[PDB]
Amino acid sequence: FCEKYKQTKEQALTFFQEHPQYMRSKEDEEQLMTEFKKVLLEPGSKNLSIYQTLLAAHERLQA
């Protein structure tokens, strides 16, 4: 679990380097967290990587 955690953090870091607005802006981070929880409420969300979850949530804001 401890290694799984460090690797999930690394994946999250790369997504936030690809999308730097979110770590600069409280409002954007908030909107993203709202969509992120909504993705995670989807059936089968266990099967997503954190990268896939973050990208899905960001795409829901681009919609």
Partner: peptide, 11 residues
């Protein structure tokens, strides 16, 4: 980062 990881691991 930690808030994103802790939410993800609880899905």
């Amino acid at each position: 980062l930690q808030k994103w990881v802790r939410v993800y691991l609880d899905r």
